[PDB]
Curated annotation (Swiss-Prot), chain B:
The gene is C6. This is Complement component C6. Belongs to the complement C6/C7/C8/C9 family. All cysteine residues are assumed to be cross-linked to one another. Individual modules containing an even number of conserved cysteine residues are supposed to have disulfide linkages only within the same module. Changing A20E: In allotype C6 A. Component of the membrane attack complex (MAC), a multiprotein complex activated by the complement cascade, which inserts into a target cell membrane and forms a pore, leading to target cell membrane rupture and cell lysis. The MAC is initiated by proteolytic cleavage of C5 into complement C5b in response to the classical, alternative, lectin and GZMK complement pathways. The complement pathways consist in a cascade of proteins that leads to phagocytosis and breakdown of pathogens and signaling that strengthens the adaptive immune system. It is linked to Complement component 6 deficiency: A rare defect of the complement classical pathway associated with susceptibility to severe recurrent infections, predominantly by Neisseria gonorrhoeae or Neisseria meningitidis. The chain holds residues 100 to 148 of 934 of the full protein. Residues 1-35 form the TSP type-1 domain. It is found in: Secreted; Target cell membrane. Component of the membrane attack complex (MAC), composed of complement C5b, C6, C7, C8A, C8B, C8G and multiple copies of the pore-forming subunit C9.
UniProtKB/Swiss-Prot annotation, chain C:
It is found in: Secreted; Target cell membrane. The lineage of its organism: Eukaryota, Metazoa, Chordata, Craniata, Vertebrata. Disulfide bonds join C35-C46. It is linked to Complement component 7 deficiency: A rare defect of the complement classical pathway associated with susceptibility to severe recurrent infections, predominantly by Neisseria gonorrhoeae or Neisseria meningitidis. C-, N- and O-glycosylated. O-glycosylated with core 1 or possibly core 8 glycans. This is Complement component C7. Monomer or dimer; as a C5b-7 complex it can also form multimeric rosettes. Component of the membrane attack complex (MAC), composed of complement C5b, C6, C7, C8A, C8B, C8G and multiple copies of the pore-forming subunit C9. Transmembrane segments: none annotated. Belongs to the complement C6/C7/C8/C9 family. Component of the membrane attack complex (MAC), a multiprotein complex activated by the complement cascade, which inserts into a target cell membrane and forms a pore, leading to target cell membrane rupture and cell lysis. The MAC is initiated by proteolytic cleavage of C5 into complement C5b in response to the classical, alternative, lectin and GZMK complement pathways. The complement pathways consist in a cascade of proteins that leads to phagocytosis and breakdown of pathogens and signaling that strengthens the adaptive immune system. C7 serves as a membrane anchor. It comes from Homo sapiens (Human).
From Swiss-Prot, chain F:
It comes from the Eukaryota. It comes from Homo sapiens. This is Complement C5 beta chain.
């Protein structure tokens, strides 16, 4: 099992790459007197929004 | 990074060899930076080696 | 695989132990990283420019 | 503009690049270029 | 050596800048996607930014990712981060540069 | 014959700007990155071009 975990972590192009994200946040909450500059249809995990 | 094991007893008198690596290596992503740098000598001629 | 090995001059197995199928791959072919700063031999091996 | 090489062209343009096409920037120092324009 | 790529980037990433990073691949035919990402150094543990870019004959296999090092996500403290990993990942290659 | 760089010099270029061009050719079997660059002065015109004048000249 160490083969699967470590080498797929280290060299992802070497394995079948599910590159498209599987999970997303809901849309960012609007502010009082403010909005999001990069509004979009999907918000992958770890994405920043301004 | 190195992973290593020990001989509990050697082979001898024609018994089966250990037949497997005593040390394995795995590529890491390192946490620290290399503090090793070239200690270029003051005056001796530096060979390209 | 060979179920039963031919023995005592019993007839060896006949035909190929492999066959090949076309597919659609899920995984991509990894490319060469070129020699960068190193000299490239025509084969694609790399050596010190020195 | 221009340069001694593709790598030098990129460096003097103020760029850098990742490629497998047998070139790399790393040879060239981050020197304070001072040509007058 | 038909399948090749260039990713080209500013010589230095300015902190908090919106930096436009552009990728070209050569000799591919099947439409495929890559991600370009900025990651903490040396550990690659923290992604400062990432961009999915689709590359196709439709794009002549060219795209750019726009990536920004938000100033607060850097660890800061006594030591400024001096260096960062730019990364590319695709079905066909991965490379990272400091 | 290759398409020329027919482009508007957009307003973000008005500080003197720069151009770089490149291709990769795969050669016989070995690839080479080929590239060139040039300097482009863009005449310092502001975006606002704020014009202020004493009307009772």
């Amino acid at each position: 099992d160490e083969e699967l975990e470590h080498l797929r972590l280290l060299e992802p192009h070497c394995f079948p790459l599910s590159l498209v994200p599987t999970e997303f946040c809901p849309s960012p909450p609007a502010l009082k007197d403010g909005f999001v500059q990069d509004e979009g249809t999907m918000f992958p995990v770890g994405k920043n929004v301004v | 990074q190195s992973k290593v094991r020990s001989v509990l007893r050697p082979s001898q008198f024609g018994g089966q060899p250990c037949t497997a690596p005593l040390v394995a290596f795995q590529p890491c992503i390192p946490s620290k930076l290399c503090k090793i740098e070239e200690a270029d000598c003051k005056n001796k001629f530096r060979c390209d080696s | 695989s060979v179920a039963v090995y031919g023995q005592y001059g019993g007839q060896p197995c006949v035909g190929n132990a492999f066959e090949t199928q076309s597919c659609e791959p899920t995984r991509g072919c990894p490319t060469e990283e070129g020699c960068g700063e190193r000299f490239r031999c025509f084969s694609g091996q790399c050596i010190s420019k020195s | 503009g221009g340069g001694l090489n593709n790598a030098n062209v990129f460096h003097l343009a103020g760029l850098t690049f990742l490629t497998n096409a047998n070139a790399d920037d790393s040879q060239e120092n981050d020197e304070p270029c001072k040509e007058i324009l | 050596q038909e399948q090749t790529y260039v990713i080209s980037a500013p010589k230095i990433f300015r902190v908090g800048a919106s930096e436009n990073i552009v990728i070209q691949v050569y000799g591919y035919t099947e439409a495929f996607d890559a991600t370009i990402s900025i990651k903490s150094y040396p550990d690659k543990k923290f992604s400062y930014s990432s961009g999915h870019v689709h590359l196709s004959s439709e794009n002549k296999f060219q795209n750019s990712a726009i990536l920004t090092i938000q100033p607060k996500q850097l660890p800061g403290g006594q030591n400024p981060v001096s260096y960062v990993y730019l990364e590319v990942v695709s079905k066909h290659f991965s490379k990272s540069k400091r | 014959s290759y398409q020329s760089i027919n482009i508007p010099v957009t307003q973000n270029m008005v500080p003197s700007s720069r151009l770089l061009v490149y291709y990769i050719v795969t050669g016989e079997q070995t690839a080479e990155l080929v590239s060139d660059s040039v300097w482009l002065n863009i005449e310092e015109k502001c975006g606002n071009q704020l014009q202020v004048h004493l009307s009772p000249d």
